[PDB]
Design a protein around this ligand. Structure first.
Ligand code: CYC
Ligand code: CYC
Ligand code: CYC
Ligand code: CYC
Ligand code: CYC
Ligand code: CYC
Ligand code: CYC
Ligand code: CYC
Ligand code: CYC
Ligand code: CYC
Ligand code: CYC
Ligand code: CYC
Lengths: 70, 48, 162, 172, 161, 49, 172, 162, 172, 172, 172
């Protein structure tokens, strides 16, 4: 499941699921420990726009959004 | 307030999603002020 | 939605912990307090109609110019949407009374208030004055701990708007 | 998160209405029975460890395969995980019982749980059973405690059962 | 200060013990080295200036240290530095005679690290000046005394770092 | 004249005041921390990981 | 991120070629019209708040269900989210307009957006409409501003429209 | 699962690095050591039956009261589950011997030990005393580096339980 | 993570048994051949750069499309990524070779890899080939090194090959 | 961060005043000389590597102790740190030169720097010298570049020097 | 981190020299005594819990004030804090003993420790004593173990003592 206990407001109670695929940006070779670029985050509704903003900000591609709590 | 540090660009660039946060204040990092090192020495306080 | 019950449960959960005597004592407060709260709720509920018309008018009496043409207290639609809005506030006050906390107010009126009011050119002053008036009249519908409860929540809205 | 009052409020709001005299008195009754409710939640908290332990002893008495190699409560690491899950579920059932609403249980514990266990290879039917045993013992305690005033707690015992039964159904 | 012998006496005095047999072994050793420590001490003394004119040459001068911006730039500071060097040599000779480093703590190391930090005196460079004098000393004093002289130079240098 | 050395001291005489790399870290005691090792959860990790 | 030049460059590179005299002059023309472009972007920035506000007033004038309980722009919390989204989209449309390319709009804003709204229960057709109203007013401003030199901005007004129309199409 | 081989590989991987002379030297230790380890393993393996019965009994001889009625060393099922448990320990000791590290012990007995023992009212003291006894008898089945290995792992379990 | 011993142990445990005399001697033999194994791992480490370089030169000799614009090893950024992946795979193959088990290779490197490349548009058949070339050269080195004692390393050369062949199969 | 205009503004504000006709024309002159300024910053950027390299070669030519064991630019790790610091300082000097104000240099680079070096045992006088050499060569380039229009850049060469001299003074 | 070899290497390098035949044979001797060293480290590891426990029992036997209210090993958390610090120090002493050098002990454990305790109000003299007791028992075990080959371990017992004595001195 998700992260679990959220904020106490009703607008923090709704958690959603995002499957992404982050792309290599530009400008630089990553020689550190790399991970396979798929993954998924579960994010509560109160947070969501920073998270999707930084996901699409780093050349990412949001593949799916899912209603898992609500 | 806690989410502001973890959703910042400095966390997402360096630590990503699987790397435990580690000490970076003792080497040089890009876009640093040179007071950042002796402040980190004051913050450090020994290994024990 | 913030109530005494949800708050103590949230605090237990976040420490991975069963509810203990600290948390159950807290809950007893909320349950002991329900009688006064719910008396305030019933009085505010049945007087709603007039409390709303009283406060709506008082917004125009305190800001006379609002009711002139070209202004935002003119025409059926503005004056209609006003009554509605004060009615929303009284509604959530009764909900907060019944619920045992500010949750309903926090989630449905406070979260986002200023952004909305700022985009729509709605001055908080009106709403404070609506609420100050509602507070004046609720002085003689209730007394004792039901009045204190009614007051607690009316004042909570006024601080949210300042 | 919802409690029984908050639930009322959400349904009222969806009508655009102040709470119905119907709903008001349903909630007045919840306040009426709240001392009993506190004793019922206290019954579980005060015997949490034994409730889990006794459920456990009995689960493995019945299903001796779980504690053989190849079994999902073997070796110590897995048994500790299983004991931990028993506690987690008993915990959210007690929260629901204080709240008068199942939502915290469904939202923070039961949502996704079955699919987790299947991914893990954890036998859901065994987990359902462990929950049924916790229910038996937990209610035992709700019904026969230390110097509580004598009265009728069957309404609350039912409601506690439905929370145990929700969890079981959701998982099996 | 204390030497080998008073180190033992004070360790027993605090227990109010008469000297016992194992303790007496320890005093026997000090009297066995007493001849070599004295002959060796003399040699160092009259050859001191020669000795000091080899440690600086192999560890301090012909460098940025003696150039403008360096801590042993100016005749004033060059003089202060080789003055210091003479202290170290002289006290190490005391410690080695006494067979106890306590004098190096009481009269040389106490506060010296911070004194050097406060003036800007380069610590690492001073240690090399100590370990170069040790190197020279160990040649001059011979097999008999080399290890025993050496340790109090090593005491001095780990006292700064 | 300024870049004058010893009697030729050729090229493998040590510098006066030697330092020996990772001693500024040893002086401040930041040896295990500068640089800190990177710890990360690999996929399908075991219990000890 | 792409702009109109960067786009040219990527297509040239995929041929293994220096830019065609064709492509060169297309870009020389973009530089030719760039003062007008700056005024057009400035028209939107300088009236952003009113563009959102006026679009909003009109959206809820038409769709009075959104501001009833049960509606997706009720209570204050949801209205603020809706007002915020109107701003976000107007913002990425202005970025595309400075850039001469839709990519920042498609990549940072439109990609996944429809599926977000459906997950949320946000009525996409209403969101599409709010975007159509922003377009009307935004272009209004691009066409009738404070003491800008008189000339023809229809090419730029079209291009701005296609960015508004991309967003609408992508969302509905 | 912690072995010398897995440890050096883990350390290489985490620095994105091929195995170098440091890591291969380490591996040679584990391989050079296998003979003593595996002799201990074979001796513990064939004596398992009696080592287990010896230690089980010693738990009752050191805690006489356990074997009285109403107690946890009484009846076929307790005494059966005890033999089994000591057998589990000896089994993982042999595995740790063969594997070249504590991994099997860490993953299958140490991780979770206290939580389990605490829920089931199992005193570590019994298990320490089972192991102390096994250590006494293994003194005359092995010697030299096989004994040192056997000891290393028995002691490792005793420290895990203290 | 598993090595060849750890694998034995897991299978034994699933029986509830001390290791079989069968399994014991299989592992005694692995210890018997371990000096050769260390030389084999050392052969790869000591020539890693050349193994990658030589594989590379030859991959692009064969597939000159990858280094044209439009090709997946063009421009410098992509070539560096491709060179990096060659190193990563050679690295996990050497780990498997020290371990006597493929698991670290399958779990940390091969798991998901094909689907990554397809998402990226990286031609898997070309990647498979680059792995086949690394194999040829790596084994070359395992078989003909600096003053190692003469003997038979074919068993180890086979096993190394299967790790290269696992990777190839998994990716193509 | 300040630039030369921002500095004017801060001083004006501390009087509670609109900018003095005095200050206005001082800033009009900065705009007057700004093409020259851009060439001056460009002179440094375009030769950064050589400026650092040439400063370096000469620093160690003079101070052969730094590259002996015991020396602060030995072994490779320390030399790379020293080369890196040379670049960092040249970088903030170029920023100050674009800005017409030293503040970015003083605030982000020079503040605390001396005390850092002393803590590290880095000989500050040698670092000061490396900065003096960068200055000589950097200005060399500012004064004798590729087909720039002929004129007088001495005002800018002075100002660049004071930034180099600030850094030197601050560090020694 | 240093070990006894690494220490040799650092001193050699500061001379600019290959290791002296002096230093070589000192290190050959460390390899000569390394089996004994492994037994000595093993003696501590194999009895860590008892070494801490026995030191502890005796510390509080002597200093019954620490376990009274007002005392620094009262209530249960403080005692738990005191019991690992005992473990932490015993741990770094064993590391130093494997290494043949005190540096890991001084750098990771002893550096700052005294000033920590003084800030906390932890009586350093009591902590020093707890370290002295660990030393007595630890060495006890180093000297009288399970079927180790008979020989002379006094050199190693001394060296272990100096690590215990370093810690004590550093803390008191
Ligand atoms: C680098 C390895 C390392 C060491 C050595 C270490 C020491 C250390 N000991 C601490 C506390 C402590 N240490 C003790 C120890 C003692 N109390 C007594 O009376 C005895 C004399 C003594 C036991 C022998 C106690 C009681 C505290 C808790 C003090 C307090 O919170 O009041 C703390 C404060 C943080 C905490 O409480 O966890 C540190 C950092 N921390 C480390 O990370
Ligand atoms: C759930 C809780 C909740 C609140 C509190 C709420 C307030 C609120 N008031 C609004 C409008 C309004 N509010 C008023 C208010 C007034 N006009 C007057 O005559 C008086 C001066 C004053 C009453 C004191 C007016 C005139 C409008 C119309 C604004 C417009 O669209 O131009 C709107 C814009 C949507 C709409 O036009 O209905 C919101 C969201 N909405 C909510 O969902
Ligand atoms: C610290 C948090 C807290 C608790 C726990 C609490 C309990 C509590 N339980 C009460 C009654 C009671 N509690 C019970 C409970 C039971 N009767 C049975 O026979 C069953 C075995 C059990 C079922 C749950 C009954 C029957 C009464 C008397 C009737 C009533 O007051 O509702 C009362 C009223 C006083 C009394 O009659 O004793 C209190 C204050 N009050 C609190 O503030
Ligand atoms: C600015 C203040 C200042 C002065 C003056 C100074 C002098 C000075 N003269 C030196 C050597 C020397 N100086 C001389 C000078 C002379 N030989 C003769 O016979 C003549 C009498 C005389 C020339 C007129 C010689 C020959 C040496 C080499 C001595 C040696 O290497 O042993 C050295 C050691 C070499 C070095 O590291 O630089 C210093 C520091 N240092 C200072 O900081
Ligand atoms: C990349 C830039 C970006 C966009 C575009 C974005 C959209 C977006 N809109 C959201 C919610 C929302 N969006 C609206 C919008 C509307 N409601 C209506 O009825 C109207 C039709 C419409 C306004 C015109 C509402 C009401 C919600 C809240 C839904 C809820 O929580 O119930 C959310 C969920 C997170 C949150 O509530 O903050 C996202 C991610 N987020 C981003 O980061
Ligand atoms: C600070 C950033 C910045 C801006 C905003 C900018 C604007 C700018 N707009 C210009 C012209 C103009 N701008 C427009 C714009 C319009 N004409 C109309 O009738 C429409 C209402 C509107 C459509 C967008 C026209 C027609 C011209 C004259 C033709 C041209 O220069 O292309 C010019 C040329 C000088 C002039 O003729 O006034 C400048 C410098 N320059 C800048 O550096
Ligand atoms: C893979 C490694 C592993 C270990 C070590 C292990 C220990 C272990 N011992 C258990 C029970 C037990 N353990 C004992 C132990 C003893 N009884 C006696 O006569 C003696 C006093 C003592 C032996 C020294 C007893 C009596 C039980 C039954 C406890 C109960 O269910 O009441 C259980 C509970 C499940 C069950 O009932 O089997 C576990 C998990 N399980 C594992 O999977
Ligand atoms: C777990 C260890 C591990 C592996 C194996 C791994 C593979 C991997 N290869 C990648 C890219 C890549 N891989 C290649 C490889 C090739 N291109 C070709 O044409 C050849 C056929 C082939 C070289 C033989 C290229 C060109 C990219 C960049 C694709 C792009 O961004 O367009 C990426 C995307 C992230 C990035 O670019 O850094 C991953 C995750 N990552 C890992 O962490
Ligand atoms: C630092 C880590 C480490 C390494 C690398 C190591 C290697 C090592 N390889 C050995 C033997 C050997 N190594 C090989 C290897 C080969 N023979 C061939 O013809 C092939 C070209 C190659 C195939 C891999 C052979 C045949 C022997 C002799 C037989 C044996 O000892 O098994 C031996 C036994 C002594 C000897 O005969 O030389 C050692 C110690 N030991 C170590 O501790
Ligand atoms: C804000 C911008 C900024 C500056 C200016 C900066 C300086 C700086 N220089 C450092 C080290 C260093 N700096 C040097 C520089 C030199 N060595 C010499 O002998 C020469 C005299 C000189 C080169 C001209 C050396 C050698 C070190 C490493 C010291 C050591 O670790 O021993 C360190 C310690 C961290 C590290 O090593 O990365 C800092 C923070 N850091 C910053 O973030
Ligand atoms: C891409 C950013 C950018 C740069 C770099 C830029 C440079 C630039 N430098 C210029 C002039 C010039 N630049 C210099 C510079 C110099 N004269 C000398 O003799 C010195 C060697 C050197 C001292 C720095 C001089 C003297 C002029 C002519 C006078 C002036 O226009 O101020 C001019 C005016 C046109 C011309 O006369 O060529 C431009 C546009 N413009 C830009 O937009
Ligand atoms: C798993 C890691 C590991 C360990 C622990 C190890 C121990 C080990 N200790 C040994 C010897 C020994 N160990 C000792 C130790 C002692 N003698 C005493 O009387 C004291 C009580 C004790 C002091 C520490 C002595 C005296 C010898 C025989 C002399 C020697 O080989 O140096 C030997 C040589 C074979 C033998 O003579 O038994 C080994 C292999 N080897 C390893 O690979």
């Amino acid at each position: 499941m998700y992260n679990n206990v959220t904020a106490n407001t009703e607008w923090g109670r709704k958690v959603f699921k995002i499957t992404v695929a982050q792309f290599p940006d530009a400008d630089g070779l990553d020689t550190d420990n790399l991970s396979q670029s798929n993954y998924f985050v579960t994010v509560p509704l109160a947070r969501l726009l920073p998270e999707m903003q930084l996901i699409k900000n780093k050349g990412g591609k949001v593949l799916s959004v899912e209603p898992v709590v609500s | 307030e806690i989410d502001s540090y973890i959703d910042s660009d400095e966390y997402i660039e360096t630590f990503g999603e699987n790397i435990v946060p580690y000490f970076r204040g003792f080497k040089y990092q890009t876009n640093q002020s040179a007071g950042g090192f002796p402040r980190m020495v004051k913050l450090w306080g020994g290994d024990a | 939605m913030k109530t005494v019950i949800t708050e103590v449960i949230a605090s237990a959960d976040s420490q991975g912990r069963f509810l203990n005597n600290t948390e159950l004592q807290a809950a007893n407060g909320r349950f002991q307090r329900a009688t006064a709260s719910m008396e305030a709720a019933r009085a505010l509920t049945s007087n709603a109609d007039s409390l709303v018309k009283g406060a709506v008018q008082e917004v125009y009496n305190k800001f006379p110019y609002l009711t002139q043409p070209g202004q935002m207290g003119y025409g059926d639609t503005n004056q209609a949407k006003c009554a509605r809005d004060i009615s929303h506030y009284l509604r959530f006050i009764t909900y907060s009374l019944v619920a045992g906390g500010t949750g309903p107010l926090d989630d449905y009126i406070v979260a986002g208030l200023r952004e909305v009011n700022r985009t729509f050119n709605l001055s908080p002053s009106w709403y404070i004055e609506a609420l100050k008036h509602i507070k004046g009249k609720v002085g003689s519908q209730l007394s004792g701990q039901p009045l204190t409860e009614a007051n607690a929540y009316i004042d909570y809205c006024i601080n949210a708007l300042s | 998160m919802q409690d029984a009052f908050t639930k009322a409020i959400v349904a009222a709001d969806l009508r655009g209405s102040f709470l119905s005299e119907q709903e008001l008195n349903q909630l007045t009754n919840l306040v009426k029975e709240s001392n009993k409710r506190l004793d019922a939640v206290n019954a579980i908290t005060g015997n949490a460890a034994e409730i889990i332990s006794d459920a456990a002893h009995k689960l493995f008495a019945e299903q001796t395969d779980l504690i053989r190699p190849g079994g999902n409560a073997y070796p110590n690491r897995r048994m500790a995980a299983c004991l931990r899950d028993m506690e987690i579920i008993l915990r959210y059932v007690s929260y629901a019982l204080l709240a008068g609403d199942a939502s915290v249980l469904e939202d923070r514990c039961l949502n996704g749980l079955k699919e987790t266990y299947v991914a893990l290879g954890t036998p859901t039917r065994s987990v359902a059973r462990a929950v049924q045993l916790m229910k038996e013992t937990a209610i035992g305690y709700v019904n026969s405690p230390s110097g509580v005033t004598r009265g009728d707690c069957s309404a609350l015992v039912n409601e506690a059962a439905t929370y145990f039964d929700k969890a079981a159904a959701s998982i099996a | 200060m204390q030497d080998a012998i008073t180190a033992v006496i004070n360790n027993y005095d605090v227990q109010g013990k008469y000297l016992d047999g194992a303790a007496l072994d320890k005093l026997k050793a000090y009297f066995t080295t007493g001849a070599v420590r004295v002959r060796a001490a003399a040699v160092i003394s009259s050859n001191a200036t020669t000795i000091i004119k080899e440690a600086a040459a192999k560890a301090l001068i012909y460098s940025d240290l003696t150039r403008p911006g360096g801590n042993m730039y100016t005749t004033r500071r060059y003089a202060a530095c080789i003055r210091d060097m003479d202290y170290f040599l002289r006290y190490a000779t005391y410690a080695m005679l006494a067979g106890d480093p306590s004098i190096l703590d009481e009269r040389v190391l106490n506060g010296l690290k911070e004194t050097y930090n406060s003036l800007g005196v380069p610590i690492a460079a001073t240690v090399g000046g100590i370990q170069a004098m040790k190197e020279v000393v160990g040649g001059l004093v011979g097999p008999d005394a080399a290890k025993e002289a050496s340790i109090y130079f090593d005491y001095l240098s780990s006292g700064l770092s | 004249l300024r870049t004058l050395g010893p009697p030729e001291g050729g090229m493998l005489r040590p510098a006066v005041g030697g330092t020996a790399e990772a001693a500024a870290q040893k002086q401040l005691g930041i040896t295990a921390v500068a640089p800190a090792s990177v710890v990360e959860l690999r996929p399908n990790a075991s219990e000890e990981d």
